[PDB]
């Protein structure tokens, strides 16, 4: 009895508005036992008493210590590692790379009391998928600090003894205090005998059976490792196109899309993919309705998402109320390449081919085509936008040599690719990206990002050499460009604690300032890493190599929505990059973070919270999560459906994109009740779309619709 | 009034011109009425009416008069059509000289340019003298429609025809024998041309339509075995895509793929099931089809852990997640499975991954399979599921009945009676149509040089066109050599497929017009009256095929992988056949197999296999033959396609109507299955054997499961390797009753 009361007293230390009486009462313990107490505390998590999220977490942590060690106090780090290596749960390279004395020293870095800083949802995620445990019985073998210290130890294991343990302590401190947020594959895998860490894959399909086959094989290999897939299939020629003469005739893109879909789902009882194609593709009107609920199974491919690729010329046809001409890529020499790489050349070829009567083509009204796209985007939420000209005029890569011609599953990755002619084709290029994030809630000031960038960039860069590559074309891209994708979490909390909001423009200057610091320090870190270990082999293919920086090539319309000046010495950085190079071709990308950000109780990525308390279902109960410091900042927060429209948020995304190397998983959101007759007008959908383009937004991800066309009014619009 | 001639000029209407061409086409025909053809035409003579439209009206009228009482309208209409085609291609009835025709077509890019390299102008003059263009007048109307539809070189976006049938035949012959020495080349060309143009040898569609054109795509029959790995699954899928793009039929062995829930690497992961991979194979099959096209049969063992889920994949019920409806399936069975049924016992289902050695033994070693099977049944540590054999077999035959397209492969029969040593090159699957039986090996990559994809080149002897079995000696020589040359002639898009073809040089030569053949000999399917004749017939076929391939071996060398055959051991099909066949025939061997046995062991065979009995539903139409070994459905067959209603009458209905035995006049399947068993005694590969049932022959209009099972067991008893279609006419189980059965 009192043994339980003492643990409750212990877990409630330093908490406000929590009642041990209530936990006892709710648990019905008087009528294993500790698990019931944990759940009762978690069920008391609310707006009025958010601190229950820490009471329940600490009870849970206490329980896991006993479960793993038979006592609250963890064993010595060395004794733990030895035991786990023998059990085959840790990688045996740990005992070969580090001596017993070094494990003793690393143990002195460890602060096990930091386990008491997790929220309840954080502990459940750790227990659920991160902590090393028994496959079947679910018996946990470790605690959170052992995870953190060994992730740091593995990633910096090859560092010289002069600096190695110093880096290990730095990184361990950074992650265990939630300054740096690591993705799920790293949190679960690094320190274990696995080498599978790639979570997102970008594959470009060529217009041939061999490439379609290779692409399919590559998809299968990577979905079996539960990686998200980005597929460029826009090159595949249209239905009816001649083949060799034609000695045969093309039976269409859709049967090949269907084959890609069964590849994606081949290891699902699941697999997720986004497929990309140009808006002017001859089959586009058929491709746009592929997810539509009503139709024949023969002309539907519903279990993939799609990204429609658009440039300025397309939008211009819309604004002028003119036609868009559709072509098969096979019938228009140079057009596909120019679409991504050279806009004035695209316009030259496009108008030329439009006037050529010998070329198979179809004409549709731009209003009609755009409306069909946004109609399907609204009903599914899963028809995405890629502004391919923005992705190449404002890019780390020289589009003449390494154009960006697609994205990933979640539309934040922007990397070069090359089609494979065989699954083992050494001339192909499959884009991979290693991810992480800065927790904007946990940093005290922006200059703290200097060392954090050094730690984050070096840790991920070492992972590139550490991880394995199931496909040669994937290794080539990774070793060649060493592309990283570091983003942010807790942005909403960050804005709230600074008294700014999403929708009114109050955060425009702060956002400019914040993401200037992020990119500057990321670049500086990668530049210093290049001095020490050498620039990435294909650095010469970047705009950085030419002394071109993101501050040179951003969408100039940003100047009209923010006057925050640059605070860092970009001109000195410019010279140093041009001279010493970068270890990594890309550093930044703003991913969604709905899972990994739970560890630090962060708001998800750059998104506003839906509510003050989020309710999720889990393996063994319901998980409640309260936004950071609700107690003091509830009025400061701006919830998603409290925003009047998308303008404010889109302006912020544009401001971020000024500095981001890759792209951003930008959402659009609509509340039907905010409109007459409960219907979002097509005019509004198009306007926001145009707004996004105006401020340099590269991609549009989810369209969220809350569950509970005058072309003259767009004529004055300046793209 | 005026008609408009073909050259655009006008001319006064002259009905005598219509009468003349009808008179020409009716020459030698019986019971045809030119008056009736004229009356049936009701030609609406308006000013400017084209003679070409007049002629098409008259063709259709003649075609509409085709009936069992007046079958010769088949030929009246055909000759009128041939006439029409001569005009479209040549601007006159008489074809140009062969050399001038060939030069013109090569210039137009319609014929292969190698023709002009391999033969001089003089040699083309010589070949022209071989040609008899009047042989075009021997086609039936259905035949001409096939020629016009898919065989004659043409520009289909224009529609115009470029050649005639005898140019097709002569140049197929010229191309296939082009590499022969001048001492014998033109002699082979003439003999082969005569064989095909007089319908002695029937060639498959890829050859008829393609050989003489610039293409090298002729493979229409592909067998791919999938390994239990992502790499092989990917390779298999890629191989499927490549070959369906060439419109080949696919046989897929996916039986090795481990069951849903199976551990992987420990397991570090767990298997999500066969069905998602099957779905992937299906989209591969359909990848080059407008969303008809892309055809595959997928094979798996009866004892597979997921078999009950697999058997219902074509079922119209159920969610889309557990259905793969656009492929066919072949259930693999052996003696032990049937035995469990007879004794009313259980069958144990295993994932192939959980039973080391079982999968291989299933095909190659029945004794070892039985040892392993019972051992693993008694091992409680091995994941398994037990099901009543009655339940499992009933489910299978139920889905076979409802779809017609759940097939059976008796894998023990395929390996105990086989041209291949199962310890070296076992047969572990079949093809789309269940007559092919060849070795395979999984690929770990689409370009894997160590895998083996099975290919087969097909043809058939026309049993209705031969006058005695001894004619097969020369016909086998011609057929074997022509196909063997095609092996070196055609392309191979996948290395593993070239390996099998060059290594084994496997052929599949079958028959057409079997029903007509039985009728003219006064025999029938159902009463056993055809047993001895069938024995005599297929002994002659296999003997002469073997003799030809053996002589070809002496001349050009045995196939590289000949030592993997049972033939190389000195073993013949007459040594290994199902012994129960001794009870249903007493026809003695008429040919010297012992001398052949010695000759084969010394000089080998050019080809690892020679014979296989395919359906041949299209190629039979060319020679107006009854389809393969199947009995006719009726005296008159009808295809209501294209121009209108296309009718075809069985050969010589006039004299043999009472001699024919129609499919639905059969008391059952036993007579047919005995004949198949007798055929299989000599056939290298297998036979596309059909089962047939008329619900109205049974009480309450239901075909009893007891009967489905009895026929299944009867097939096995007489060594039948496979079962293809179950046909059900369109207009509960007692194991004690089955216990009597002797497998
Ligand atoms: N038989 C087919 N049926 C339907 N589509 C096909 C077929 N063959 C190829 N395709 C598709 C796949 C590709 O998208 C495209 C071209 O395929 P490919 O393998 O490159 O043919 P090819 O290279 O021999 O001819 P081409 O020079 O026209 O590309 O057409
Ligand atoms: N003057 C005519 N009056 C009525 N029918 C005719 C006449 N001339 C030809 N026909 C019929 C006979 C045939 O059934 C049909 C086509 O015969 P056909 O000889 O090919 O016509 P055609 O004379 O225009 O061709 P061609 O110039 O090659 O001789 O038209
Ligand atoms: N991630 C996955 N999800 C579902 N099925 C998978 C997955 N990976 C592989 N499979 C299937 C495909 C094969 O049928 C089978 C084994 O594939 P395979 O490529 O041979 O794995 P493996 O060789 O690394 O492990 P193992 O030694 O168990 O075969 O499991
Ligand atoms: Cl679908
Ligand atoms: Cl600009
Ligand atoms: Cl995440
Ligand atoms: Cl289906
Ligand atoms: Cl026997
Ligand atoms: Cl056929
Ligand atoms: Mg090509
Ligand atoms: Mg005439
Ligand atoms: Mg394996
Ligand atoms: Na593939």
Numbering used by the authors:
A (entry chain B): 19 to 49, 57 to 294, 299 to 737, 1365 to 1375
B (entry chain A): 5 to 295, 298 to 737, 1364 to 1375
What did the original publication write about this model?
Class Ia ribonucleotide reductases (RNRs) are allosterically regulated by ATP and dATP to maintain the appropriate deoxyribonucleotide levels inside the cell for DNA biosynthesis and repair. The α2 subunit houses the active site and the allosteric sites, and the β2 subunit houses the di-iron-tyrosyl radical cofactor.3−6 On every round of turnover, these subunits come together to form an active α2β2 complex, which allows for the transfer of the radical species from β to α, affording ribonucleoside diphosphate reduction. Excess dATP inhibits RNR through the creation of an α–β interface that restricts the ability of β2 to obtain a position that is capable of radical transfer. ATP breaks the α–β interface, freeing β2 and restoring enzyme activity.
We, therefore, sought a different crystal form for α2 in which the β-hairpin region of the cone domain is less restricted by lattice contacts. With this in mind, we were able to obtain a new crystal form of α2 by fusing the 35 C-terminal residues of β (341–375) to the C terminus of an 8-residue truncated α (α2–βC35). The overall structure of this crystal form with dATP bound at 2.10-Å resolution is essentially identical to that observed above for free α2; however, the cone domain is slightly less restricted by lattice contacts near the β-hairpin. With the restraints of the crystal lattice relaxed, helix 2 adopts the unwound conformation, as in the α4β4 complex. The hydrophobic pocket vacated by H46 is left unfilled in this structure, and residues 19–27 (helix 1) and 35–43 (helix 2) that interact with β2 in the α4β4 complex are exposed to solvent. This structure thus demonstrates that specific contacts with β2 are not required for helix 2 to be unwound and this structure reveals a connection between dATP binding in site 1 and helix 2 unwinding.
